[PDB]
Design an enzyme around this catalytic site. Sequence first.
Site, PDB file in Angstrom:
ATOM      1  CE1 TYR A  91      -3.049  -3.084   1.136  1.00  0.00           C
ATOM      2  CE2 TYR A  91      -4.291  -1.366   0.071  1.00  0.00           C
ATOM      3  CZ  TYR A  91      -4.177  -2.656   0.481  1.00  0.00           C
ATOM      4  OH  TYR A  91      -5.193  -3.551   0.234  1.00  0.00           O
ATOM      5  N   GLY A 100       2.504   3.702  -1.828  1.00  0.00           N
ATOM      6  CA  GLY A 100       2.907   3.783  -3.226  1.00  0.00           C
ATOM      7  C   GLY A 100       2.006   4.472  -4.197  1.00  0.00           C
ATOM      8  N   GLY A 104      -2.226   3.412  -5.342  1.00  0.00           N
ATOM      9  CA  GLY A 104      -3.255   2.443  -5.076  1.00  0.00           C
ATOM     10  C   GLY A 104      -2.827   1.390  -4.078  1.00  0.00           C
ATOM     11  CG  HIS A 122      -2.041   8.293   4.054  1.00  0.00           C
ATOM     12  ND1 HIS A 122      -1.639   8.583   2.790  1.00  0.00           N
ATOM     13  CD2 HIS A 122      -2.166   9.509   4.717  1.00  0.00           C
ATOM     14  CE1 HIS A 122      -1.484   9.918   2.659  1.00  0.00           C
ATOM     15  NE2 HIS A 122      -1.798  10.488   3.831  1.00  0.00           N
ATOM     16  CG  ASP A 123      -3.695   3.965   0.004  1.00  0.00           C
ATOM     17  OD1 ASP A 123      -2.787   4.794   0.222  1.00  0.00           O
ATOM     18  OD2 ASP A 123      -3.539   3.004  -0.769  1.00  0.00           O
ATOM     19  CE1 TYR A 181      -4.251  12.213   1.860  1.00  0.00           C
ATOM     20  CE2 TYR A 181      -3.278  11.248  -0.094  1.00  0.00           C
ATOM     21  CZ  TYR A 181      -3.215  12.082   1.015  1.00  0.00           C
ATOM     22  OH  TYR A 181      -2.070  12.844   1.237  1.00  0.00           O
ATOM     23  CE1 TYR A 213      -0.416  19.434   5.420  1.00  0.00           C
ATOM     24  CE2 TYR A 213      -1.612  18.465   3.622  1.00  0.00           C
ATOM     25  CZ  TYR A 213      -0.649  18.402   4.622  1.00  0.00           C
ATOM     26  OH  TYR A 213       0.102  17.277   4.836  1.00  0.00           O
ATOM     27  CG  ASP A 242      -1.149  14.071   4.313  1.00  0.00           C
ATOM     28  OD1 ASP A 242      -1.748  13.070   3.822  1.00  0.00           O
ATOM     29  OD2 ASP A 242      -0.825  15.056   3.657  1.00  0.00           O
TER      30      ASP A 242
END
Length: 121
Positions: free
Chosen positions: A27, A29, A31, A47-48, A51, A64, A89
């Site tokens: 993960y 990377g 996708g 994290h994925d 998002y 940001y 993040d």
Amino acid sequence: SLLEFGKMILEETGKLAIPSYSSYGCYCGWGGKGTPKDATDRCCFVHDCCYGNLPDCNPKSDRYKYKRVNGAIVCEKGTSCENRICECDKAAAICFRQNLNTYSKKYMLYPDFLCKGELKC
């Protein structure tokens, strides 16, 4: 954006975002598929997923601001997208720091075919 994320990673872990965490496991990377390989890969999966809850946002290119209050990440006030991207993040950087001890080089540049199984967010 990736500029704030990579600087957040470098500050938290000592490692540069690219190549330490852009080709790690299943993960970290671009996708992802399969069962995460270790605690560090599980940070990238979460994290994925973070998002993934922000579909009309653009986390790779929308910038940001964040400040250090003695070491603590504090997300600055921005648009509602930027605030939410900053929390995804900051959670990943802290997750990566919390699992530095089990970070394994054997998982850098990991072949795709070995990413087997199903995990939902």
